[PDB]
Design an enzyme around this catalytic site. Structure first.
Site, PDB file in Angstrom:
ATOM      1  N   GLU A 205      26.630  59.476  38.346  1.00 10.43           N
ATOM      2  CA  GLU A 205      27.209  60.380  37.321  1.00 10.43           C
ATOM      3  C   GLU A 205      26.260  61.577  37.092  1.00 10.43           C
ATOM      4  OE1 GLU A 205      30.680  60.608  34.941  1.00 10.43           O
ATOM      5  OE2 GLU A 205      29.698  61.979  36.430  1.00 10.43           O
ATOM      6  N   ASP A 281      35.103  60.252  36.154  1.00 10.25           N
ATOM      7  CA  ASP A 281      35.861  61.067  35.161  1.00 10.25           C
ATOM      8  C   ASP A 281      37.253  61.419  35.665  1.00 10.25           C
ATOM      9  OD1 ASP A 281      35.198  62.877  37.139  1.00 10.25           O
ATOM     10  OD2 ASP A 281      33.962  64.154  35.806  1.00 10.25           O
TER      11      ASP A 281
HETATM   12  C1  LIG Z   1      30.895  62.635  36.715  1.00  5.53           C
HETATM   13  C2  LIG Z   1      30.499  63.778  37.616  1.00  5.53           C
HETATM   14  N1  LIG Z   1      31.395  64.960  37.465  1.00  5.53           N
HETATM   15  C3  LIG Z   1      30.748  63.240  39.081  1.00  5.53           C
HETATM   16  C4  LIG Z   1      29.522  63.358  39.967  1.00  5.53           C
HETATM   17  O1  LIG Z   1      28.417  62.588  39.547  1.00  5.53           O
HETATM   18  C5  LIG Z   1      31.173  61.806  38.847  1.00  5.53           C
HETATM   19  O2  LIG Z   1      32.094  61.348  39.924  1.00  5.53           O
HETATM   20  C6  LIG Z   1      31.931  61.936  37.598  1.00  5.53           C
HETATM   21  O3  LIG Z   1      32.330  60.728  37.062  1.00  5.53           O
END
Ligand SMILES: *[C@H]1[C@H]([NH3+])[C@@H](CO)[C@H](O)[C@H]1O
Ligand SMILES: *[C@@H]1O[C@H](CO)[C@@H](O[C@@H]2O[C@H](CO)[C@@H](O)[C@H](O)[C@H]2NC(C)=O)[C@H](O)[C@H]1NC(C)=O
Ligand SMILES: *[C@@H]1O[C@H](CO)[C@@H](O)[C@H](O)[C@H]1NC(C)=O
Length: 482
Positions: A205, A281
């Site tokens: 994440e 997300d």
């Molecule tokens: C949060 C970030 N936008 C992405 C990359 O770490 C991850 O897939 C999402 O859940």
């Protein structure tokens, strides 16, 4: 014998989720591997292995899906924990399906053989996703886990995010450390490895990590296997990336050691949800293909993973046929005739970039005869499939764009190649061919109000109408007018 989850159990790091459309992952498993839904009547069926511990009953899928279209609605958890993967819901990002859900995968975009027996993987186009936000037994917080997947190392993009593994139960970004999942693709927004990609990375994440450092890590190589084994594991300030050719040889370790020394990655805050094809997300821009994979409790030994990789190699994954029906030869010139009653004197033609249907006969202008004639060439993104080059406009091919078929010049890009590759299928109404999108295998050449689209059998676009779907995607292959 022993399947992957028997091997993980023997290493005292047992599977807590075990997902495959191709095969059983336990030697004694004989239950349903996945659920299908067909477009003709919207009913469902399940596909089990043909023998305990064996290979999916692909023949039963072919029978259920005959003269229609199929979606994979559920990838069942073989472990008994109930962690089945279903249509992913909206989260931080909306998907493109009803109520912001993500699309289901086609059942036929990823044909393979396993030791010569046909089976089907999960071919995921951008917008496709599966999830389980009520998972049990999965690691949470800083608890140890392992995972692996067998993926198509050639089917990927650079959009967030083609993931498999541990994610947030809310479908939203709850911060650094609230994910631990396999990623495959050539994103360079966060991390990346050596060469041009794609790379196996770990989504933790707000970062895809190719090793200890944010951004570049030299030890994470570009993947050049058609079938890739990605094995990832994480525990208390330790994690690892290992990769193999799923068809040959052993795992190599491309990262192993401490968590990235950036705020929020140690200890981890895992939530225990499972995602496939999307970010935690609900980021839904990525593409990829999933054949099999698991998540474990505990941190698997290298030895346990090596035994799993030996098992994968012995399953003997080979590319399957994407083509059925009459099909084509490179350099053939054809005209494609509408078979829908009331439209049977019309042919696929074009008016500048608009691909359409028009009445074409021996009295038509030579201009229209050329617009209704197509040179078939080797598929630009897949050499089993085909691309359709304009006779009047050489160098221009039929491509989908916003799911409308357009005649556009080949710009040499991966994206154009993918948007311009179609796989012949025995016609859904038995009259000639249906032309399935390679990149979006839920979609087919389909005429709607005499305009060509890449349409699904039901869907959110008006031209995805189920009315006359089978007839409107079936075309007879005729001698070219010009
Ligand atoms: C949060 C970030 N936008 C992405 C990359 O770490 C991850 O897939 C999402 O859940
Ligand atoms: C991921 O790899 C693709 C394919 O090689 C790269 O594609 C290029 O993308 C740019 C625009 O983004 C185009 O101008 C080039 O023509 C593309 N090349 C090909 C061969 O299609 C893409 O850049 C890579 N993504 C990242 C983030 O590095
Ligand atoms: C189903 O499709 C097959 C393959 O094109 C064909 O042989 C058969 O006639 C079709 N049946 C119907 C009812 O369309």
């Amino acid at each position: 014998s022993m399947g992957p989850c028997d091997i993980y159990e023997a290493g005292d790091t047992p599977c807590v989720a075990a997902h495959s459309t191709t095969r059983a992952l336990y030697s004694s498993f004989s239950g349903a591997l996945y659920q299908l839904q067909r477009g003709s009547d919207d009913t469902t069926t399940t596909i089990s292995p043909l023998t305990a511990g064996g290979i999916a009953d692909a023949s039963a899928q072919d029978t259920f899906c005959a003269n229609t279209t199929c979606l994979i609605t559920i990838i069942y958890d073989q472990s008994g924990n109930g962690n089945h993967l279903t249509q992913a819901p909206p989260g931080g990002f909306d998907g493109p399906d009803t109520d912001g859900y993500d699309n289901l995968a086609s059942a036929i975009g990823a044909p393979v053989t396993l030791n010569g027996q046909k089976a089907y993987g999960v071919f995921m186009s951008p917008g496709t996703g599966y999830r389980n936000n009520e998972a049990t037994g999965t690691a949470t917080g800083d608890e140890a886990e392992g995972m692996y997947a067998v993926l198509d190392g050639t089917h990927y993009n650079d959009a967030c995010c083609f993931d498999y593994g541990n994610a947030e139960t809310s479908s939203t970004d709850t911060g650094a450390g609230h994910m631990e999942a396999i990623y495959l693709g050539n994103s360079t927004t966060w991390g990346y490895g050596a060469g041009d990609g794609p790379w196996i990375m770990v989504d933790m994440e707000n970062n895809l990590f190719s090793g200890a450092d944010e951004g570049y890590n030299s030890g994470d190589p570009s993947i050049s296997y058609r079938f890739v084994t990605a094995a990832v594991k994480g525990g208390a300030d330790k994690w690892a990336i290992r990769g193999a050719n799923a068809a040959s040889g052993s795992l190599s370790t491309y990262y192993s050691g401490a968590r990235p020394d950036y705020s929020g990655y140690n200890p981890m805050s895992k939530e225990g949800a499972i995602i496939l094809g999307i970010g935690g997300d609900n980021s839904n821009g990525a593409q990829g293909t999933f054949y099999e994979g698991v998540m474990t409790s505990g941190y698997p030994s290298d030895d346990t993973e090596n035994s799993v990789q030996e098992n994968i190699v012995a399953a003997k994954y080979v590319v399957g046929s994407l083509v059925s029906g009459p099909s084509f030869t490179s350099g053939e010139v054809v005209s494609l005739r509408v078979t829908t009653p009331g439209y049977t004197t019309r042919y696929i033609a074009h008016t500048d970039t608009t691909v359409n249907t028009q009445v074409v006969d021996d009295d038509s202008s030579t201009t229209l005869k050329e617009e209704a004639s197509w040179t078939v060439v080797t598929g630009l993104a897949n050499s089993q499939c085909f691309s359709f080059e304009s006779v009047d406009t050489p160098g221009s091919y039929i491509r989908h764009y916003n799911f409308e078929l357009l005649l556009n010049a080949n710009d040499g890009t991966k994206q154009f190649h993918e948007d311009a590759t179609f796989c012949p299928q025995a016609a859904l109404n038995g009259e000639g061919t249906s032309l399935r999108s390679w990149s979006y295998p839920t979609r087919y050449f389909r005429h709607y109000e005499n305009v060509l689209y890449a349409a699904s059998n039901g869907g959110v676009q008006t031209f995805d109408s189920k009315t006359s779907f089978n007839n409107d995607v079936s075309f007879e292959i005729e001698t070219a007018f010009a």
